[PDB]
RNA sequence: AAAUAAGGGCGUAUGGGGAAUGCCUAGGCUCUCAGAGGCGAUGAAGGACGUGAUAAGCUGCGAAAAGCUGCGGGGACUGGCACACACAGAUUGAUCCGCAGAUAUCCGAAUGGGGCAACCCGCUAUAUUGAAGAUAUAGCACACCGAUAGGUGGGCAAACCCGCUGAACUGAAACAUCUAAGUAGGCGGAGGAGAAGAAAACAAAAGUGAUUCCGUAAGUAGUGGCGAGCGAACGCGGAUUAGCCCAAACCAGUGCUACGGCAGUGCUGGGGUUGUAACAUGCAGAACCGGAAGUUACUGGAAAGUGACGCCAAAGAGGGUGAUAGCCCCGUAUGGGUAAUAAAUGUGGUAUCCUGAGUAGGGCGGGACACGUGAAACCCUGUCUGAAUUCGGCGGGACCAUCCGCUAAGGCUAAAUACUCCUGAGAGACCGAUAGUGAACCAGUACCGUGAGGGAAAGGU
RNA sequence: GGUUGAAGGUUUUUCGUAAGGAGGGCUGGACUGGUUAGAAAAGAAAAUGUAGGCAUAAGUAACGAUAAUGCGGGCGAGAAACCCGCACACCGAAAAACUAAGGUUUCCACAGCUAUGCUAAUCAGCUGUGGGUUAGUCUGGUCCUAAGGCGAACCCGAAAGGGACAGUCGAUGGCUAACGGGUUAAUAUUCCCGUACUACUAAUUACUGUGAUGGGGUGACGGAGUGAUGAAAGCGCCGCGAACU
RNA sequence: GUCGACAAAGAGAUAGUGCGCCUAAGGGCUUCCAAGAAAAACCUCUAAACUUCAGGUAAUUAGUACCAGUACCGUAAA
């Protein structure tokens, strides 16, 4: 946490909108990681607003 | 909704065309209250991977299924003793 | 802003002759933003963006359903450079 | 092969057609008991657009988008209707339930301006080539008050209740007075109720003592082109029970409008209010925990059925299971556990002064009182006029005298009473798919109209 | 009473004054009902009654401008209607091209002949899958205003509300820089080719009073008639290029 | 070259710099009474503002030009 290693983490962990483009161009090996990262970014945003 | 017969439990059929076909519970539909026990309800399916008439395991009502007691072989009802371990109310041997 | 690239026969038959590439971009984005997005997402010096809005199918069967209208952008990349995709 | 009357009539059998009947329920109807009666500028009701490994609809949810976090319960499956090929998560304890939080695009009171709802276009501060074309965040509507940092209200939505307006058909066997009816309709506000409510009241020689509601009184008195019709009150029996605060006279401080101040009008404090009339620990409280007892032979696709022999019962309500089950399952009676909240521990008195003024009455024109101008009391006023202060004033159905009762022109007040957009539990000599809500089923849908609006059919392997 | 076969449907026998009761065979595969007493959504053949289903007229009217068709090949199981080719005919100030209002994917390709097409269909504006609409100059907004609408303030009205100044919206009008060819099955003043134009910003030089919401000019306008000159289309002639006899 | 039926790069072909007739398209002009929109845009002036600034003019270079429609029918089978 520490509000410094997490504010940048919530922005650098947005590989969700790169895996989504990869899957849209061609089906990826394990498509179930999209949902995992889409909920991990939400967890990060929740922890960030809770501080 | 709670159930007293989970997956991986050797049971015995007490009602139906079989009425005594033992087996092991594989899958449990809790909403429909029906368990699939291996070896019972061998139904045929006409699948159109060249394949003809395949054999499959069909579901059966949990009311027609009873657990086998660790004592002499006979169907029994189960209770709860607390851990919350379940015993058989016919010999008290868990 | 960029959702996915367009891969159809009409766009692939011109991505070779000319240097035009298609993208499916957000609905509420303008050419000034599309150019900068493709620029600082591929680094290919995008020129001459052209946007085009599509419409939903609004089909009906026996039940109705639309098909999520979008906006497509055709970028004209500089000569000598190409997009990887 | 046979038969043959081209064809028709009658009787039997077997087919197609159709959906009635029978059985069943996914849904409805009328209610009982106990609660609750609102949401919204921290942005409502109602929508548009999006969101899935796969996604056309429905459901859920909003760019954190079939989901995120915390506290409890729970213990093996889970990724909604939805399956199938799959791919993943999960005893380190998932999925799921209860409560409390975060995010919550656009339109819509819509509130920065505009507009053809889901759109367009801005200003001021910062940062991005900053500079043109543009962007990311915050603040930018109106009315009131607060002196100023800022608070209050805009709108929507069942019935009950209050106030302002307010018809006609109909009946009178016609019709105008009258009824229908202060009904239908329109407008505004508030609460779980609202209104009313504490005597200028009834009553009658005996008495009662605020209001509201129920039964009688009573279809009585009365009213009425005395026609149709309308229709009290007193008293009695019950539910509930509760009574109080100001203005004024008077006493202090204080502001304004002859060298003691006084008078008038303000503010605060005291005084004063009437009808025999100043000077922490336990119970309850969310999900939840646990909850008794049957074997055999026969028919049968299948036992719950039949026969035999047993057991439980503070549990023989109900539902499901291959046919009808107290002992197969979920349950039921009894018993535990719960977060927030909670539960019991002054007297007398002469004189003087004050008791609500454009007020009570009265004239003119109306309205409500069962009461239609009639012998017409009582209550309100659109216009005009206009009294006294307690040996005073009002009422006791025109009015006068005597007796009796009360004390107007200021205010607040629970209970018993009415309703259901809802909530939890439970019933029906209630319906069973042309029935029951228009809608048991992708129903206010498909179709019809420019629009207000009208409005179906459709259950079963 | 009933899965050793209930209700329901179809035939048959018998009993009663009748409404009706009882029994048997077939289908049917789960409920039903005697006696006494009670209640009522308690009985259809007619209301030019209502809803659904099905007949008759009857294989009858009709198959929607009397502009017209014939043959040979192709796919195909199947061709009077589809595709190709040669002939014939019709419109041609049109039945031709663009496009506004409006429709809102009907556009293009491949599979299909179930329903749709007043016939069949291998066809389709039909069904199912894959695509298709590219603007500094075209049409609207970011510019302006008319008729009209809203309208703080103000004036009226039981309430809702009405009028209306400033202001603010409102084209059917004013202002504003582009033309000719080519390509795809579907887009082309948009893409490409050739050649131009307009507005804004940042640098550099020579420079300097810039300057409205205020004043003024222009924008800015009728009917009819029309010389002279002269475009684009159109007609005639010679020359030149290509093909054929 | 795509799958023999099609078929784009290229050549004839810089194929008259051809002649005559014809050609108001529009703007002007004449006349008449029924007397024939508004505002924005464009030009000029000044009020407040500031002076060696900022803004204005001319020439060159570079950069930037936004949002919505564009298919198809449209004297009709849409």
TrEMBL record, chain B:
Is RNA-binding tagged as a keyword?
yes
Q: Which GO terms describe its molecular function?
A: rRNA binding; structural constituent of ribosome
Q: Which residues form a coiled coil?
A: none
Q: Which GO terms describe its biological process?
A: translation
Q: Which PROSITE patterns match?
A: RIBOSOMAL_L24
Report the GO terms under cellular component: ribonucleoprotein complex; ribosome
Which terms are listed as keywords in the entry?
A: Ribonucleoprotein, Ribosomal protein, RNA-binding, rRNA-binding
Q: How does it assemble?
A: Part of the 50S ribosomal subunit.
Q: Which HAMAP family match?
A: Ribosomal_uL24_B (MF_01326_B)
Protein task: One of the proteins that surrounds the polypeptide exit tunnel on the outside of the subunit.
Q: Which PANTHER family match?
A: MITOCHONDRIAL RIBOSOMAL PROTEIN L24 (PTHR12903)
Instruction: State the similarity comment.
Output: Belongs to the universal ribosomal protein uL24 family.
What name does UniProt use for this protein?
Large ribosomal subunit protein uL24
Q: What taxonomic ancestry is recorded?
A: Bacteria, Pseudomonadati, Bacteroidota, Flavobacteriia, Flavobacteriales
User: Which gene carries the instructions for this protein?
Assistant: rplX
TrEMBL record, chain C:
A Pfam family matched by this chain, by name? Ribosomal_L23
Which key words tag this protein in UniProt?
A: Ribonucleoprotein, Ribosomal protein, RNA-binding, rRNA-binding
GO cellular component assignments: ribonucleoprotein complex; ribosome
User: MF terms per GO, please?
Assistant: rRNA binding; structural constituent of ribosome
Q: Which domain of life is it from?
A: Bacteria
Tell me if DNA damage is a UniProt keyword of this record: no
Cited InterPro entries: Nucleotide-bd_a/b_plait_sf, Ribosomal_uL23-like, Ribosomal_uL23/eL15/eS24_sf
Is the keyword Electron transport in the record? no
Any GO BP: translation
HAMAP family xrefs: Ribosomal_uL23_B
State what this protein does: One of the early assembly proteins it binds 23S rRNA. One of the proteins that surrounds the polypeptide exit tunnel on the outside of the ribosome. Forms the main docking site for trigger factor binding to the ribosome.
Q: How does it assemble?
A: Part of the 50S ribosomal subunit. Contacts protein L29, and trigger factor when it is bound to the ribosome.
Family note = Belongs to the universal ribosomal protein uL23 family.
Q: What is this protein called?
A: Large ribosomal subunit protein uL23
Q: Which organism is it from?
A: Flavobacterium johnsoniae
The gene that this protein is the product of is: rplW
